[PDB]
Coordinates of C-alpha atoms in Angstrom, one line a residue:
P1 CA 15.0 9.4 40.9
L2 CA 15.5 7.8 37.4
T3 CA 12.3 7.9 35.3
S4 CA 11.3 6.0 32.2
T5 CA 11.2 9.2 30.2
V6 CA 13.1 11.5 27.9
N7 CA 12.9 14.8 29.8
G8 CA 9.5 13.8 31.2
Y9 CA 8.0 12.4 28.0
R10 CA 7.5 8.8 26.9
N11 CA 8.8 7.5 23.6
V12 CA 7.3 4.0 23.1
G13 CA 8.4 1.6 20.4
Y14 CA 6.7 -1.6 19.2
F15 CA 9.0 -4.5 18.5
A16 CA 7.6 -7.1 16.2
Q17 CA 8.1 -10.7 17.2
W18 CA 8.1 -11.8 13.5
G19 CA 10.6 -9.1 12.6
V20 CA 13.6 -11.3 13.4
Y21 CA 13.0 -13.5 10.4
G22 CA 12.6 -12.1 6.9
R23 CA 13.0 -8.5 7.9
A24 CA 16.1 -9.6 9.9
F25 CA 15.5 -6.9 12.5
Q26 CA 16.9 -7.9 15.9
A27 CA 17.4 -6.1 19.2
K28 CA 21.1 -5.5 18.4
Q29 CA 20.2 -2.9 15.8
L30 CA 18.4 -0.8 18.4
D31 CA 21.7 -0.7 20.4
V32 CA 24.2 0.0 17.6
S33 CA 22.0 2.6 16.0
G34 CA 21.5 4.6 19.2
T35 CA 17.7 4.2 18.8
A36 CA 17.3 2.4 22.2
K37 CA 18.8 5.5 24.0
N38 CA 15.9 7.5 22.6
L39 CA 13.2 5.0 23.7
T40 CA 11.6 4.7 27.1
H41 CA 9.4 1.7 26.6
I42 CA 9.5 -1.2 24.1
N43 CA 6.2 -3.1 23.5
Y44 CA 6.9 -6.7 22.6
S45 CA 4.3 -7.8 20.0
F46 CA 2.6 -10.0 20.8
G47 CA 1.2 -12.4 23.3
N48 CA -1.8 -14.5 22.2
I49 CA -4.8 -15.6 24.2
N50 CA -5.7 -19.3 23.9
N51 CA -9.1 -19.9 22.3
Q52 CA -9.6 -23.1 24.4
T53 CA -8.3 -22.1 27.9
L54 CA -8.8 -18.3 27.5
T55 CA -5.4 -17.6 29.1
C56 CA -2.0 -16.3 28.1
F57 CA 0.1 -19.1 26.8
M58 CA 3.3 -20.1 25.0
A59 CA 3.2 -22.3 22.0
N60 CA 5.0 -22.9 18.7
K61 CA 2.3 -23.0 16.0
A62 CA 2.0 -20.9 12.9
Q63 CA -0.7 -18.3 12.5
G64 CA -3.0 -19.7 9.7
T65 CA -5.9 -18.2 7.8
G66 CA -9.6 -18.6 8.0
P67 CA -11.8 -18.2 11.1
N68 CA -9.5 -20.5 13.1
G69 CA -6.1 -19.4 12.0
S70 CA -5.2 -17.8 15.3
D71 CA -6.3 -20.8 17.4
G72 CA -3.3 -21.7 19.6
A73 CA -0.9 -19.7 17.4
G74 CA 2.4 -18.6 18.9
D75 CA 6.1 -18.4 18.3
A76 CA 8.0 -19.6 21.4
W77 CA 11.0 -20.0 19.1
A78 CA 11.3 -16.3 18.3
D79 CA 10.3 -15.4 21.9
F80 CA 12.9 -17.4 23.9
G81 CA 14.1 -20.4 22.0
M82 CA 16.2 -19.0 19.1
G83 CA 19.9 -18.9 19.8
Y84 CA 22.0 -15.8 18.9
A85 CA 25.6 -15.9 17.7
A86 CA 28.1 -13.5 19.2
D87 CA 28.1 -11.3 16.1
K88 CA 24.3 -11.0 16.2
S89 CA 23.6 -10.4 19.9
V90 CA 23.3 -7.2 21.8
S91 CA 25.9 -8.2 24.4
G92 CA 28.3 -9.4 21.7
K93 CA 28.4 -12.8 23.3
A94 CA 26.7 -15.9 21.9
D95 CA 23.8 -17.6 23.8
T96 CA 25.2 -20.6 25.7
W97 CA 23.7 -24.0 26.3
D98 CA 23.3 -23.2 30.0
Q99 CA 20.9 -20.3 29.4
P100 CA 17.3 -21.0 30.2
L101 CA 16.5 -17.9 28.2
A102 CA 17.3 -17.1 24.6
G103 CA 15.4 -15.6 21.7
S104 CA 14.3 -12.0 21.6
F105 CA 13.4 -12.1 25.3
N106 CA 17.0 -12.5 26.2
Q107 CA 18.1 -10.0 23.6
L108 CA 15.8 -7.3 25.1
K109 CA 17.1 -8.3 28.5
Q110 CA 20.6 -7.5 27.2
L111 CA 19.3 -4.2 25.8
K112 CA 17.8 -3.2 29.2
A113 CA 21.2 -3.9 30.7
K114 CA 22.6 -1.0 28.6
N115 CA 19.7 1.3 29.1
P116 CA 18.7 1.7 32.8
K117 CA 15.6 3.9 32.0
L118 CA 14.2 1.4 29.4
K119 CA 11.2 -0.7 30.1
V120 CA 9.9 -3.7 28.2
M121 CA 6.2 -4.4 28.0
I122 CA 4.4 -7.4 26.7
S123 CA 1.6 -6.4 24.3
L124 CA -1.3 -8.8 24.4
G125 CA -3.5 -9.2 21.3
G126 CA -3.1 -7.0 18.3
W127 CA -5.1 -6.9 15.2
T128 CA -4.6 -10.6 14.4
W129 CA -4.9 -12.0 18.0
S130 CA -7.9 -10.3 19.4
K131 CA -10.5 -13.0 18.8
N132 CA -10.7 -14.3 22.4
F133 CA -10.8 -11.2 24.5
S134 CA -14.6 -11.0 24.7
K135 CA -15.0 -14.5 26.1
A136 CA -12.0 -14.2 28.3
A137 CA -13.4 -11.1 29.9
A138 CA -17.0 -12.5 30.3
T139 CA -17.0 -13.3 34.0
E140 CA -15.1 -12.5 37.2
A141 CA -13.8 -16.1 37.1
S142 CA -12.6 -15.8 33.5
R143 CA -11.1 -12.4 34.1
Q144 CA -9.2 -13.6 37.1
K145 CA -7.9 -16.7 35.2
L146 CA -6.7 -14.7 32.2
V147 CA -4.9 -12.0 34.3
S148 CA -3.3 -14.6 36.5
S149 CA -2.0 -16.6 33.5
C150 CA -0.5 -13.6 31.9
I151 CA 1.3 -12.4 35.0
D152 CA 2.6 -15.9 35.7
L153 CA 3.9 -16.3 32.2
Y154 CA 5.3 -12.8 31.4
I155 CA 5.7 -11.0 34.7
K156 CA 6.9 -13.8 36.9
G157 CA 8.6 -15.1 33.8
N158 CA 7.6 -18.7 34.1
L159 CA 8.1 -20.3 30.7
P160 CA 7.4 -23.9 29.5
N161 CA 10.2 -26.2 28.5
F162 CA 11.0 -25.7 24.8
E163 CA 14.0 -26.5 22.7
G164 CA 16.4 -26.7 25.7
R165 CA 15.1 -23.4 27.1
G166 CA 12.4 -22.3 29.5
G167 CA 11.5 -23.1 33.1
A168 CA 10.3 -21.3 36.2
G169 CA 11.6 -17.7 36.3
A170 CA 13.4 -18.0 33.0
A171 CA 12.2 -14.6 31.9
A172 CA 12.2 -13.0 35.4
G173 CA 12.8 -9.2 35.6
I174 CA 12.5 -8.5 31.9
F175 CA 8.9 -7.4 31.6
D176 CA 8.0 -4.2 33.5
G177 CA 4.3 -4.3 32.6
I178 CA 1.5 -5.4 30.3
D179 CA 0.1 -3.5 27.3
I180 CA -3.5 -4.4 26.2
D181 CA -4.2 -4.4 22.5
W182 CA -7.8 -5.6 22.2
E183 CA -9.0 -4.5 18.7
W184 CA -11.7 -3.8 19.5
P185 CA -14.1 -4.4 22.4
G186 CA -17.9 -3.9 21.9
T187 CA -17.8 -3.5 18.2
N188 CA -17.2 -5.6 15.0
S189 CA -14.9 -3.0 13.5
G190 CA -11.9 -5.3 14.3
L191 CA -11.0 -8.4 12.4
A192 CA -14.0 -10.3 11.2
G193 CA -14.7 -13.3 13.4
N194 CA -13.5 -11.8 16.7
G195 CA -15.6 -12.5 19.7
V196 CA -17.9 -9.5 20.2
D197 CA -20.5 -8.5 22.8
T198 CA -21.9 -5.1 21.9
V199 CA -23.8 -5.1 25.1
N200 CA -21.3 -6.3 27.8
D201 CA -17.8 -5.9 26.3
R202 CA -17.5 -2.3 27.6
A203 CA -18.3 -3.2 31.2
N204 CA -16.4 -6.5 31.0
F205 CA -13.3 -4.7 29.6
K206 CA -13.4 -2.1 32.4
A207 CA -13.5 -5.0 34.9
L208 CA -10.7 -6.7 33.1
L209 CA -8.4 -3.7 33.2
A210 CA -9.2 -3.3 36.9
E211 CA -8.3 -7.0 37.5
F212 CA -5.0 -6.5 35.7
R213 CA -4.3 -3.5 37.9
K214 CA -5.2 -5.3 41.1
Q215 CA -3.2 -8.4 40.4
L216 CA -0.1 -6.5 39.1
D217 CA 0.0 -4.4 42.3
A218 CA -0.6 -7.5 44.5
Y219 CA 2.4 -9.2 42.9
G220 CA 4.5 -5.9 43.0
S221 CA 3.9 -5.7 46.7
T222 CA 5.5 -9.1 47.3
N223 CA 8.7 -8.1 45.7
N224 CA 8.7 -4.4 46.3
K225 CA 8.2 -3.5 42.6
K226 CA 5.8 -1.2 40.7
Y227 CA 4.4 -2.7 37.4
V228 CA 2.6 -0.6 34.8
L229 CA -0.4 -1.3 32.6
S230 CA -1.0 0.3 29.3
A231 CA -3.2 -0.1 26.3
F232 CA -3.5 0.8 22.6
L233 CA -6.2 3.4 22.4
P234 CA -8.4 3.6 19.2
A235 CA -8.7 6.6 16.9
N236 CA -12.2 5.9 15.6
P237 CA -14.7 7.7 17.9
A238 CA -17.1 4.8 17.3
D239 CA -14.5 2.4 18.7
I240 CA -13.8 4.7 21.5
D241 CA -17.4 4.8 22.6
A242 CA -18.0 1.1 22.0
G243 CA -15.2 0.0 24.4
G244 CA -15.5 2.8 26.9
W245 CA -11.9 3.8 26.1
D246 CA -12.6 7.4 27.1
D247 CA -14.1 6.4 30.5
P248 CA -12.0 8.1 33.1
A249 CA -12.5 5.1 35.4
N250 CA -10.3 3.0 33.1
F251 CA -7.4 5.4 33.7
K252 CA -7.4 4.5 37.4
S253 CA -6.4 1.0 36.1
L254 CA -4.2 2.0 33.2
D255 CA -1.1 4.0 33.9
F256 CA -1.2 5.3 30.4
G257 CA -2.3 4.5 26.8
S258 CA -0.9 5.3 23.4
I259 CA -3.4 6.6 20.8
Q260 CA -3.7 5.1 17.3
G261 CA -2.4 7.8 15.0
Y262 CA -2.0 5.6 11.9
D263 CA -3.9 3.1 9.7
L264 CA -6.6 5.8 9.4
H265 CA -6.9 4.9 5.7
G266 CA -5.2 2.3 3.5
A267 CA -5.1 0.2 0.4
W268 CA -8.1 -1.8 1.7
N269 CA -9.8 0.9 -0.4
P270 CA -7.6 0.2 -3.5
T271 CA -9.1 3.0 -5.7
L272 CA -8.7 6.0 -3.4
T273 CA -5.3 7.3 -2.1
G274 CA -5.4 9.2 1.2
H275 CA -3.7 9.9 4.5
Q276 CA -3.2 7.0 6.9
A277 CA -1.7 9.2 9.7
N278 CA -3.0 12.8 9.3
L279 CA -2.6 14.9 12.5
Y280 CA -5.6 17.1 11.6
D281 CA -9.0 16.6 9.9
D282 CA -8.6 17.0 6.1
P283 CA -11.2 19.2 4.4
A284 CA -10.3 17.6 1.1
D285 CA -11.3 14.1 2.2
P286 CA -14.3 13.1 0.1
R287 CA -15.5 10.1 2.1
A288 CA -18.5 9.7 4.4
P289 CA -18.2 11.5 7.8
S290 CA -18.2 8.1 9.7
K291 CA -15.0 7.1 7.9
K292 CA -13.0 10.3 8.2
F293 CA -10.4 10.3 11.1
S294 CA -7.4 12.3 12.3
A295 CA -5.0 12.0 15.3
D296 CA -6.3 15.3 16.6
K297 CA -10.0 14.1 16.5
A298 CA -9.0 11.1 18.6
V299 CA -6.9 13.0 21.1
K300 CA -9.6 15.6 21.7
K301 CA -12.2 13.0 22.4
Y302 CA -10.0 11.5 25.2
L303 CA -9.2 15.0 26.6
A304 CA -12.9 16.0 26.5
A305 CA -13.6 13.1 28.8
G306 CA -11.4 14.5 31.5
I307 CA -8.6 12.0 31.1
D308 CA -5.3 13.3 32.5
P309 CA -3.2 14.2 29.4
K310 CA 0.0 12.8 31.0
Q311 CA -1.6 9.3 30.8
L312 CA -1.9 9.7 27.0
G313 CA 0.5 9.3 24.1
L314 CA 0.3 9.7 20.4
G315 CA 1.4 7.0 18.0
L316 CA 3.2 7.6 14.7
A317 CA 4.1 5.3 11.8
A318 CA 7.5 4.1 10.7
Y319 CA 5.9 2.8 7.6
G320 CA 3.7 3.9 4.8
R321 CA 0.6 2.5 3.0
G322 CA 0.6 2.7 -0.7
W323 CA -1.3 2.5 -3.9
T324 CA -0.2 1.9 -7.5
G325 CA -1.7 3.4 -10.6
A326 CA -2.2 6.7 -8.7
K327 CA -3.1 9.3 -11.2
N328 CA -2.6 12.4 -9.1
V329 CA 0.1 13.8 -6.7
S330 CA -2.7 15.3 -4.5
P331 CA -4.3 13.0 -1.9
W332 CA -7.7 11.5 -2.2
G333 CA -7.2 10.7 -5.9
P334 CA -7.9 7.6 -8.0
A335 CA -5.6 4.6 -8.0
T336 CA -5.9 1.0 -9.3
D337 CA -4.7 -1.2 -6.5
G338 CA -2.4 -1.6 -3.5
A339 CA 1.3 -1.0 -4.3
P340 CA 4.0 -3.7 -4.1
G341 CA 5.8 -3.8 -0.8
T342 CA 9.2 -5.2 0.2
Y343 CA 7.8 -7.5 2.9
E344 CA 4.0 -6.9 2.8
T345 CA 1.7 -5.8 0.1
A346 CA 0.8 -2.1 0.1
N347 CA 3.0 -1.5 3.1
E348 CA 6.6 -0.2 3.1
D349 CA 9.2 0.8 5.6
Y350 CA 10.1 4.4 6.2
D351 CA 13.7 3.5 5.4
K352 CA 12.8 2.7 1.8
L353 CA 10.1 5.3 1.3
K354 CA 12.5 8.1 2.4
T355 CA 14.1 7.9 -1.1
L356 CA 11.1 6.9 -3.2
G357 CA 10.1 9.4 -5.8
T358 CA 9.5 12.9 -4.4
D359 CA 8.6 13.8 -0.8
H360 CA 5.5 15.8 0.1
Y361 CA 4.5 17.5 3.3
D362 CA 1.3 19.3 4.2
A363 CA 1.5 21.3 7.5
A364 CA -2.2 22.1 7.3
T365 CA -3.2 18.5 7.8
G366 CA 0.1 17.3 9.4
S367 CA 0.7 14.7 6.8
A368 CA 3.3 13.5 4.4
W369 CA 3.5 11.2 1.3
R370 CA 5.8 10.0 -1.5
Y371 CA 4.8 10.1 -5.1
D372 CA 6.8 8.8 -8.1
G373 CA 4.1 9.2 -10.8
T374 CA 2.7 5.7 -10.3
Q375 CA 2.9 4.8 -6.7
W376 CA 1.5 7.0 -3.9
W377 CA 2.6 6.3 -0.3
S378 CA 1.1 7.8 2.9
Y379 CA 3.7 7.9 5.7
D380 CA 5.4 9.9 8.5
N381 CA 8.7 11.8 7.8
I382 CA 10.9 14.1 9.8
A383 CA 8.6 17.0 9.1
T384 CA 5.4 15.3 10.4
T385 CA 7.3 13.8 13.3
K386 CA 8.5 17.2 14.4
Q387 CA 5.1 18.8 14.0
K388 CA 3.4 15.9 15.8
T389 CA 5.9 16.1 18.7
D390 CA 5.3 19.8 19.0
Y391 CA 1.6 18.8 19.1
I392 CA 2.3 16.3 21.9
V393 CA 4.0 19.0 23.9
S394 CA 1.5 21.7 23.1
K395 CA -1.5 19.5 24.1
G396 CA 0.3 18.4 27.3
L397 CA 0.3 14.8 26.4
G398 CA 2.7 12.3 28.1
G399 CA 4.6 11.2 25.0
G400 CA 4.8 9.4 21.7
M401 CA 4.6 5.9 20.3
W402 CA 5.9 4.1 17.2
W403 CA 4.7 1.2 15.1
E404 CA 7.0 -0.4 14.5
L405 CA 10.7 -0.2 15.1
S406 CA 12.0 -2.2 12.1
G407 CA 10.8 0.5 9.7
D408 CA 13.2 3.2 11.1
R409 CA 16.4 1.2 11.8
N410 CA 18.6 4.3 12.2
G411 CA 16.1 5.8 14.6
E412 CA 15.7 9.0 12.4
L413 CA 12.1 9.5 13.3
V414 CA 12.4 8.2 16.8
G415 CA 15.3 10.5 17.2
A416 CA 13.7 13.5 15.8
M417 CA 10.9 13.0 18.4
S418 CA 13.3 12.5 21.3
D419 CA 15.4 15.5 20.3
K420 CA 12.3 17.6 20.5
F421 CA 11.5 16.2 23.9
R422 CA 14.9 17.0 25.3
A423 CA 14.7 20.6 23.9
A424 CA 11.2 21.2 25.2
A425 CA 10.0 22.2 28.7
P426 CA 10.1 19.2 31.2
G427 CA 7.3 16.7 30.4
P428 CA 4.5 15.7 32.8
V429 CA 5.5 12.0 33.2
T430 CA 7.3 10.9 36.4
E431 CA 6.9 7.2 35.9
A432 CA 9.7 5.4 37.8
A433 CA 12.4 3.4 35.9
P434 CA 13.0 -0.3 36.5
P435 CA 14.9 -1.2 39.6

């Protein structure tokens, strides 16, 4: 039977909702580049949770700033309203007036039509939209309401009327599951202002995941389909404990989860360069123990809990974090500020960093970086991707994950990983592909 794997391994890629604008990264590029053929799951980022109704919703309101910036924020236009010309679509045909579905939702639908093993998941939350998870998961009633609303909107595909698009079942069949990205339950390590209950978030979150599992299976039984549930797993052991992310019980609800293997350090500390995605602990890191992370440290914590490794995956970065005024080529050195970025400050795509200054790779820590005498960038390259994939295989994990697809448009890193998967012994994942 066809499985959503590459020789038994998952290769998950995040697709940014906002990437279709300035970055001009659309689903078509995944097709023509051959990258989609190397992916097993695409996480559409993101779906927001309404601050007033505590439910999944569809709106057209810009994300603002301040404590209320995410209230009611959404981009229905990018999601399903935006019309694609024949020379910009995956199918090669333009969106017609009669289509109830357009936007990236329809583009991904066209991509799935060319990749039978490919699944599309809706990622809820994210760093910017995690403010309302705590309240939404507070009671049995609130949890039931949230889950029901998300399945109705994304799984059943019932969209509201917007710009001549939308309607009941408009997005039917596109989403194969839900990915939960609450950053982070039971702790205030996430964005300041997020709802947080250090006492009950852990238990409420466990209950929330169980409700998602229950409702997804209930719906799947009515149409003979098997939906999956995943989540973005934290790397910080403190976050892991706070949310009960390493509680085996949660993996009776989640089919799998992809572990954060990036953003372990960054320009938010403008005077100290360092690794944002090191595979192993770095003896040279001079910071306090509570701030030192590594992908390996996180992976081992989940494995120590008895969580089935096939239900885990490791995330890699298709971008780098950089500093300017970096005095040394060696990591953990002085710098003056975050470096300029093409689209976002102190952040740059792998596609641009692969030719910036000179490349550096440290197999001992499983890290890579660019240095041009002034700017220092921490990122993942072919070398770290190959080493980390060997690690995924050697640890018996279920696969890899990428944040985010627009940074590696030719699928050089995604491909290096998939190539490794196809050459390795059969993976442990048997997850069925979409019908």
